[PDB]
Design a protein around this ligand. Sequence first.
Ligand code: HEM
Ligand code: HEM
Ligand SMILES: CN(C)c1ccc(CNCc2ccc3ccc(N)nc3c2)cc1
Ligand SMILES: CN(C)c1ccc(CNCc2ccc3ccc(N)nc3c2)cc1
Ligand SMILES: C[C@H](O)[C@H](O)[C@H]1CNc2nc(N)[nH]c(=O)c2N1
Ligand SMILES: C[C@H](O)[C@H](O)[C@H]1CNc2nc(N)[nH]c(=O)c2N1
Ligand SMILES: [Zn+2]
Lengths: 413, 408
Amino acid sequence: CPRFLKVKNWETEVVLTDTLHLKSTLETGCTEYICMGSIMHPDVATKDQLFPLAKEFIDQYYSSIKRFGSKAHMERLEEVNKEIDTTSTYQLKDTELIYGAKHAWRNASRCVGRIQWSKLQVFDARDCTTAHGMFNYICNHVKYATNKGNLRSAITIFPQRTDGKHDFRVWNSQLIRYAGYKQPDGSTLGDPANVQFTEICIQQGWKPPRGRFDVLPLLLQANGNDPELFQIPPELVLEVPIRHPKFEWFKDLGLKWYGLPAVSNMLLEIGGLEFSACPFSGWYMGTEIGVRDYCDNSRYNILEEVAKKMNLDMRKTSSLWKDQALVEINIAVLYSFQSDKVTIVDHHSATESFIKHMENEYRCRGGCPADWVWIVPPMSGSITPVFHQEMLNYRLTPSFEYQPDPWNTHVWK
Amino acid sequence: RFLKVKNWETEVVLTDTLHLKSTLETGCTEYICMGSIMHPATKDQLFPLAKEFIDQYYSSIKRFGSKAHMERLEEVNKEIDTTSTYQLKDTELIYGAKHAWRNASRCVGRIQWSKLQVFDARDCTTAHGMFNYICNHVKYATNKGNLRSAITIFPQRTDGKHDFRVWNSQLIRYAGYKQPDGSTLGDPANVQFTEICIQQGWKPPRGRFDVLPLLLQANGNDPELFQIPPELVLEVPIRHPKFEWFKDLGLKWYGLPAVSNMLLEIGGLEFSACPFSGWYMGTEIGVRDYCDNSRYNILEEVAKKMNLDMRKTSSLWKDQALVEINIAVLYSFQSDKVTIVDHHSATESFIKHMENEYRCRGGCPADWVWIVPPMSGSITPVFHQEMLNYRLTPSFEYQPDPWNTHVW
Ligand code: HEM
Ligand code: HEM
Ligand SMILES: CN(C)c1ccc(CNCc2ccc3ccc(N)nc3c2)cc1
Ligand SMILES: CN(C)c1ccc(CNCc2ccc3ccc(N)nc3c2)cc1
Ligand SMILES: C[C@H](O)[C@H](O)[C@H]1CNc2nc(N)[nH]c(=O)c2N1
Ligand SMILES: C[C@H](O)[C@H](O)[C@H]1CNc2nc(N)[nH]c(=O)c2N1
Ligand SMILES: [Zn+2]
């Protein structure tokens, strides 16, 4: 591979040079004859596999704190080697854990919000042993991150995988999500995305309210045990009823959303260590709710209802009635959040900040992996600066990875 | 081996086998993806390519290994030997051009691929000749508003010293004027070219929408200027169906999009001048041409007339103004009975096309970065459609701008 790759911004003619891609560790799915860049997703490590992974990470940590080659560096290497040799694994120091989490985010090519990467509050929950303890940790996470509306990004890290039969998992894909109920008539109530997980909860004992916006309970698995249900205390769940600054009928749609986006189903990998439960949270970009959650056909699918109330010609698709309702819905989302003083960012601000971030990263780090397909917002793409920006995609480590859904792999006791 | 592509809305999974046929590279590796990078002969090189293309041509007309097939192979063989090149039959030329369209991963209009009028211009020898052929193209393709896809094919490359080139990037584009006060009148994308036309003897009307002259190079010679007779140039005044003030912006666009700077490659042969044209998807004009910062850049102006609050970005004033502009474009072309497709209809057709190609062909190379429209992405079906990108031949390729390679 060539040492220097150029990326061009086609609207500023700015040219950046990437040297960081040379540190790439995982494969992208592409080959020389086929690009998989629009593909969504293209029993443990052994002593021999673990030795180089850990060293690679440790070196990186010590290079970051400008102590590379030092006494403390070599001592740490030796202490890790000893641990892998005697216990076929090792434990990260708190400094390394915090460093590693922050870098997993920094390395997240799909995330447009990475300018904030270094302000992440890390909660070390590696002493957790039970599902009740997980629940205490997650409740504290929510309260801290939510901060009465002034959201702060945070991550809670539960114990790493050992032999694979003792995994800690959050079965929820996000800590806060709304239920979906499938009706005998084929219709769906609530959020169609969450129907399957909702059914699991019900079988596990959950009594569902059966509404449009019912917050799902946590389904928590500690130490490879069967998962357990817990209701998040309602006062810890901050919510925003959606209204429109101009259209007084918009609040009559009975729409709301939750303030805290909190992905909880990903795997955090640091130095070959696998953290299968690591819920993290930031704050919403408006389009995530306004475009995807609300206007996707397989989600809340409300464009039509919003369109009727706006009195638009919905016969000729060339009237762009869909596009017009889409904009209003997104205006309303940003207005409701800002009015309740709940942190949110519009797609114009976020994308501008990312270009700044990316330029800084190329400058100080020699690159910034980015997944254009994910970085470009799902509305008004070309009128944001990321659309014209060439991006190189590559997988650095530490990182957040996908992992199979736990109900597909769990061995029920 | 086999590759599945999922649509994350319908849950339809298609299986790609066609990609095994590619030999050309895309630029990615196992460890770096360049999916959003815009731009990543000899008798010895020439035969196996000719052979491959002849093979797939006769394989497409269900006469593989036929007598006609063997004879053509020998014929091409003998000719590459004696001459360092060879000439396509008429049928092969047409097949080759339709298939370069069919294989264009960035084109959302490929449902139409097999309906393509091919104009053989391989007997051309002068720029005057080129101008005549081009004029006929425009007239045929324009067809009084009922547009028809067409391609005009000029003599293939020989030695690189005698290329035919259409210097214009499209047959019809507006001029760009670099003003004293540093701003730009017209179209900023064409500013450079516009000034190479002035330099050559063009007399600029210095307006916002001045149709550029044709600049044509035949057989390696210097380019020559030609005005396209104005009655061949169909144009559409842009107005809005509710906003009677929109007309007063004084906006117009031409009806015929006719890319003229690409290279057509068939069977190892290079057609450096092959202007092709279809019709517009509305966003091309309404989003990119008008609203790009580095183009006409009219959002600000439109946002005024709509009396929108433009202090904070989070009022989505840009988003509102954008939608109205695109409504206006669609409305105008339709009311003028001029062919145009909206991005909702175009994307629907593409998914349908994708389904056909998997069924009968084993796949459809497609570039999600280009296929997804530059506005309202996720409310179109293609956003949710996983696509595999790969390079099949025949194809349209990029080539350098002529003014960076031509001695006079
Ligand atoms: C602080 C405010 C943040 C904003 C505004 C933001 C924005 C976004 C957006 C819009 C996406 C696309 C999500 C989607 O389309 O579903 C995304 C993805 C992602 N973000 Fe961020 N993010 C933030 C914080 C974080 C944090 C704190 C982390 C990790 C510590 C993170 C890691 C990721 C990862 C791994 C993805 C990819 C998700 C996937 O592949 O499914 N982000 N982010
Ligand atoms: C018939 C109606 C057609 C429609 C609606 C259509 C639509 C489009 C659009 C919207 C693009 C994206 C261009 C951009 O945004 O800059 C595109 C690209 C492209 N089209 Fe089509 N097109 C049509 C016909 C054709 C024809 C007739 C050909 C060739 C014979 C063709 C070959 C291509 C190629 C090669 C590209 C990629 C250009 C590049 O990489 O710069 N298309 N098309
Ligand atoms: C359709 N599908 C298969 C699918 C759906 C969802 C996902 C998960 N990404 C959702 C996410 C991640 C990180 C985020 C960070 C900040 C934020 N404000 N929001 C975030 C949202 C992956 C795949
Ligand atoms: C600045 N730059 C590097 C650049 C500039 C122009 C291009 C050309 N592609 C635009 C195109 C192609 C084919 C089209 C076919 C039909 C249609 N209705 N529209 C079409 C539009 C590529 C690259
Ligand atoms: C950087 C990026 O590749 C570039 O801006 C692309 C994105 N997608 C596009 N899609 C289309 N149809 N046309 C374009 O010019 C572009 N530009
Ligand atoms: C097919 C395609 O990869 C899929 O729909 C992607 C496109 N880009 C995306 N971008 C973001 N930010 N989030 C998504 O879920 C998706 N979905
Ligand atoms: Zn790729």
